[PDB]
Amino acid sequence: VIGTPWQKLDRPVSEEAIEGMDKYWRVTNYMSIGQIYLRSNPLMKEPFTRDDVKHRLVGHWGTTPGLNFLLAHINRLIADHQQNTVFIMGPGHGGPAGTSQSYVDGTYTEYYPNITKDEAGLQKFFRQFSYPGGIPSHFAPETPGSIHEGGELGYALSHAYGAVMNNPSLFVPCIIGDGEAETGPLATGWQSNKLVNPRTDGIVLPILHLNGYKIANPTILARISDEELHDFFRGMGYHPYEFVAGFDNEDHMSIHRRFAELFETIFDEICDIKAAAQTDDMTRPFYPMLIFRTPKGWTCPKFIDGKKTEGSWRAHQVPLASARDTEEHFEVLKGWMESYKPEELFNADGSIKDDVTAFMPKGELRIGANPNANGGVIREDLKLPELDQYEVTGVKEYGHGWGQVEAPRALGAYCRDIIKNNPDSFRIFGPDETASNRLNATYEVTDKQWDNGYLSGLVDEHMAVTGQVTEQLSEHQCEGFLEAYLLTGRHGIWSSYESFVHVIDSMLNQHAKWLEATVREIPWRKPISSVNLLVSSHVWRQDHNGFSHQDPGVTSLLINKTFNNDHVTNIYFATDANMLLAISEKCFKSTNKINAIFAGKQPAPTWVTLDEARAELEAGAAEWKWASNAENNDEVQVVLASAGDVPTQELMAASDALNKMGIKFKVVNVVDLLKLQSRENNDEALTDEEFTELFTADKPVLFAYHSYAQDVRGLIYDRPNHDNFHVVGYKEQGSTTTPFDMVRVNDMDRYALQAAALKLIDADKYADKIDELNAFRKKAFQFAVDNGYDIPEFTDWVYPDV
Amino acid sequence: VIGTPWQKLDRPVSEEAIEGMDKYWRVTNYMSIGQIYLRSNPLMKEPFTRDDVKHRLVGHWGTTPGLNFLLAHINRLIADHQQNTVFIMGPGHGGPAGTSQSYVDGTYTEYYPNITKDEAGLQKFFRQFSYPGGIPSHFAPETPGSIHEGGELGYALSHAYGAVMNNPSLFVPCIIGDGEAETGPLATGWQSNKLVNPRTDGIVLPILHLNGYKIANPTILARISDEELHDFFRGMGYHPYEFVAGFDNEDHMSIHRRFAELFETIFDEICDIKAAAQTDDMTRPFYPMLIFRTPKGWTCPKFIDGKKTEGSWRAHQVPLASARDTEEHFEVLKGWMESYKPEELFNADGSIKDDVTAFMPKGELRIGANPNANGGVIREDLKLPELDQYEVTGVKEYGHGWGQVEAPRALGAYCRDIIKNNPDSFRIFGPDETASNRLNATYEVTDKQWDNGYLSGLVDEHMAVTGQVTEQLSEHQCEGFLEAYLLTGRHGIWSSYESFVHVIDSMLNQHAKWLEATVREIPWRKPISSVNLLVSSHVWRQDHNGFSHQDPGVTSLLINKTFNNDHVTNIYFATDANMLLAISEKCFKSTNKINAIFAGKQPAPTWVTLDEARAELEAGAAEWKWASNAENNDEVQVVLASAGDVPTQELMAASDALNKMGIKFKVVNVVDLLKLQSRENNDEALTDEEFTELFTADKPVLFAYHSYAQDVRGLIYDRPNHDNFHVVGYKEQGSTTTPFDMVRVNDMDRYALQAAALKLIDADKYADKIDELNAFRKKAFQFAVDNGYDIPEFTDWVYPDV
Ligand SMILES: Cc1ncc(C[n+]2csc(CCOP(=O)(O)OP(=O)(O)O)c2C)c(N)n1
Ligand SMILES: Cc1ncc(C[n+]2csc(CCOP(=O)(O)OP(=O)(O)O)c2C)c(N)n1
Ligand SMILES: [Mg+2]
Ligand SMILES: [Mg+2]
Ligand code: NA
């Protein structure tokens, strides 16, 4: 247990804590200006001149003094209440407030010992910000206290609410840009309070950083009427509180005492909710939220060159951009930095004075030290059930190609038992598609968590106020809740229709960037559990939905996060349920990855046994020798290779026909796609030797790919024999139609694959046969048009091993 | 002018209009069930049996009777008020309601003459729905009345509000799923009423289709308290009205008269707002919105096999899934279809009776006929200013490589004059980045439109209640507002930081799917203006922001919409301002495309004159003969090729050094990326002959690519000489650092490009020189680390032609 959660003070905030927070706000504003502007002379010691100013002024002042004021007060709250706390910096461009926080709390020098608490360390700390060889301008993963960089805005609320799930002792003050609140993902993030339980989850306090402006415009929420702004928050289930300061001549000590009093009223309401939830965990409370309305750039010069800067969008990035180049801007910078009175905040040796930090929390309650902001320190491996009990044993009993299993059901049973063994640390998220993607075996041991109105057992099923599955129709919510659930040390999986994974392409990009920077250079940030995404209800079988639902291209996005032997991204094609089991175990043991797990939810054959899946998964691609009919590679006339459930079923039927014609081939199944890349691009890929053993040195290779052929063409560009591959993939053809027609129109059906194999072997010899196969594809299409189902010769085919 | 806009009735709705709407609702519910369930016998004529039921039951009933009821009432409104109207079907899976609407209004048989108004046409209409060789299950572009398919949910509101911009006569009732309202893009779409003006724009009426459920869960908005739901809408600037029906035994005629009365009160409020805005166009009104709370699946069987189906998520997809297979489900289907009393709705010949449609609008006011739902019928070409006045004439006057122009400023001036010449039909959208991306020359002739609070001329600049630029910090809003502005017949452009274009990858996928289906098979849907996106503030120069802002990969997404010689997608690399001008003119003349226009906003050289840009753009890739030093292709030792402003600047400096060494090369610039694909993949690409003329038949090619190398490797896989290309691209390296360091760490700097050229020519001979160049890259990096700016030898370089 960290601290003493949800305790009220029952005395006023002390005057010493008020004095300490004003000194914090002054020193963190002074050091944030020093990080943006100074390359030397951090204490302005004689002579202080333009030569001490950076030659490239980069970074963002406007948000920063607001964040520094909130951080003084959240620090005071943590210390006085001993409250386990992680904050979220929505305006992540306020990086200097997050680095200043960790430098004051002492974690900065603990994690970066060269950056010491004295004049030399402070000089290094100022220069390194947003500087070559230095550190980022945002609240990046290399800053203690960060689980959210806030560069791509929108995800502050889903991260906050995912951090509190199953974390009943944790408070998260979530600071949200008022410009960020104009994004789609932030606007739906406020609704998450219908999806957490005040007994079994922790508490988010949204703090809208309503400083009036974004980069070059006012914000929508700051300029609507105050009545509308409070109705809006009350309508989303909050009790809004509003604080306004800095627009008049109120002295800063008075401002701190009024804010401390308000924050204590808010925290007491949060403690009342937490106490009441011990008894009534079914009534959803109106959780507090705070509208914090202060001038953008607060405390900077009111006008610069005749233009209003404090209280304007003009304060967003770098005011005084000529500070190194003109004596006029320099004297303004000098007066601005002097206004914080640093001679009162630092000792002669350059260390921040004890009276500046006496009010701060200590130990693991410090924002920079709390293990929830470095969740791999808390993470334990999952207690996994043995995988063999889930195996589809039909392949062993009856043969390769057996049955009509819906593959994700085996993963549903495996996840049900992972939840039973890990009942508060593994969650499932889905955008109203957990049952549609066939993971509903999980409801045998838990419920979908819904903290909103119930009506009747005739409609509400598998649903309760606490539970380990969460659904909302928003891929941004599912991906963001899971990312923070992992960042805080826990585990989970989500599923999405494949075409709609694209809604969250950019969130995958950012969490991959967070992993890239972590595995490269932040070894104190310990490994977290991977993002596991079941990508299902895929392009080949959108029977009720059609063309808008046909887009497997998240493969191509994921390929753009495969560099530097970081190994943070995996793309897996589950050939059947036993392959899906073997991939899922590997994913659930893995850390520091995004694992995209492709699997079809339609009834489909099972190709391999579980032991076979385990071996083939490790290599990444495998010959299926029981399907190949060639003696050796030299007798091969064509290599039949596939990745994906439906391309594999059509390739296997093509193999059956080609065997019956007397054609010699081998069959290669591909599961771990990036293992096709060269070793020069991927030091864990097949070697050239192993790749040539599979694909041959010089025989044609027909490759039936689940996604866009471009992916495979690009990945194998420097591989031996790559000129001999013919990659057939989805090609933006399809609608609501029958299973055969959907593969027919992308030349992926068994008949077109058999024709393409013959064209690669001898197009002249097999010209008539290729025409007969193309005519059969037309007869089977007319059959579907006339009859309303596919030709039995297509539907009824079973691999002959069965 | 269409109809008589914004007119009140000042009499009650007639009883004949009530009788007509109930007959519409019955016939459209009956035909929607017929589209999902029947392959023959649409009038249930003796014998009606299981053999008339489809063998594959696909499609979605639950939303559909709600939409059919709203469409009866919107049709009655249009006819009685003569109101120019386009609706939006947010729950686009209710396709059978949109096809039934067009079949009743008569547009279906006008556009599809085989689908006649009689028993044979009705049989064909039932069978073809969601059927092989037939039509989609959603409200696809091939349905008259659609500008929004609604397959990927979320975009109903941004499309509605973009359709009304500069369309002051147009009413848009926007029907929004209550599950769809849980998405990010829909949640921020409600805020668009701060961005339209009630005098100069038209009026959206949001209608929340609050049927209680999504696929397998209740919805957040249906289960929060009613007080919260109305506070929420009032807080977002609406006057909420709520209608509840179908949960008790109220007869349907009574329901229609109560709804007609409410819809008239709402429409009168909208007419009051429109009249008042003629005089006061600065006070933002509280626009009506309608909460429409009815049971999901309304009018279907209350229980099926003991499970509650009407008023449940169970009604979402296909109830009675055994209708063909068991006599029990069949008799339920038979009784359900009989309950609409089709013998009263159709004549003996199968035509819908006159008394069913006498209340409907006629002519171009019909939902299926209105030209705003087929905007290419209204679209006129833009009146474009002559391009030569914008040319950067420095290349002609002083030489190739001249100056420090910020390229988008030339496009800003060109757009300013396009707005002046087309003052109500060309808009700019940006997510608070129009000025940051250097398009603010537009504010010389218009303002950013902001219909929300003003405070002071010291902060509000270039901003007014009417104007032709729109900014909100949401890429979903900008892309959705523009898509509908184009779909309704107008023109425009938006700009985004490159990394964040990814937020709307999935919207690009869907608008490309809408274009694919239109150019393939819907020739009555006339060409619309293209989506033009300036992709700027790119990966090489995110000086204030860093690694989260470094992701040029929308190239790779766009490559997955390049099939079938549809030619709906273009990827352009603007080498400099004159190239950007030539690309922008081509884009602004183009139709039926998505044009992604890559350009850097940093000060940069200008390489080509405007006439040169015009020629080179047409071919797609061009030799720069003034930069090449080789006699002919056979004397070339390496081809130096680049795509993108910064790769081109570094390649040109590498060319200068290589010339000075005595190395023979040629320089090829690539602007129209997909023109590198083979003709077999793209019938408008360079031919093999033209491609070999540029890249040689067998010399090494060093290709400095702006984005991820994978893209170029995949596109050239079947091109002559492709094995000799070495593609250098971004590789997930970088942070907030200097311009040289950012290209250094991706091996893109001039020194690494010169080294790679030497390694391709003779790695043994030039081993020492390659070491010297790699050491210089380390000295220039240490220089930046020590001094805080790049080495003058790097920054001060100018191509020697200048
Ligand atoms: C998704 C996304 N779109 C665009 C941007 C570009 N951008 C960086 S800061 C910023 C304005 C942020 O304004 P606000 O949230 O109000 O922050 P503050 O005023 O506290 O600086 C924008 C538009 C972004 N970072 N993320
Ligand atoms: C962005 C997105 N995510 C997921 C889906 C999958 N899906 C199709 S319908 C649907 C439920 C829609 O519920 P609602 O909007 O309430 O529509 P209605 O109840 O009127 O059928 C979902 C989850 C989708 N179509 N779009
Ligand atoms: Mg702001
Ligand atoms: Mg619904
Ligand atoms: Na090759």
From TrEMBL, chains A, B:
Residue ranges constituting the Xylulose 5-phosphate/Fructose 6-phosphate phosphoketolase C-terminal domain according to the UniProt record: 601-798
Gene Ontology terms: biological process: carbohydrate metabolic process
List of residues binding thiamine diphosphate: 63, 93, 151, 153, 179-180, 211, 296, 316, 500
InterPro entries: Phosphoketolase (IPR023962), THDP-binding (IPR029061), Transketo_C/PFOR_II (IPR009014), Xul5P/Fru6P_PKetolase (IPR005593), Xul5P/Fru6P_PKetolase_C (IPR018969), Xul5P/Fru6P_PKetolase_CS (IPR019790), Xul5P/Fru6P_PKetolase_N (IPR018970), Xul5P/Fru6P_PKetolase_ThDP_BS (IPR019789)
Chain positions recorded as Mg(2+) binding sites: 178, 211, 213
GO terms, molecular function: aldehyde-lyase activity; magnesium ion binding
SUPFAM superfamilies cross-referenced by the UniProt entry: Thiamin diphosphate-binding fold (THDP-binding)
Family that this chain belongs to: Belongs to the XFP family.
Name of the protein in its database record: Probable phosphoketolase
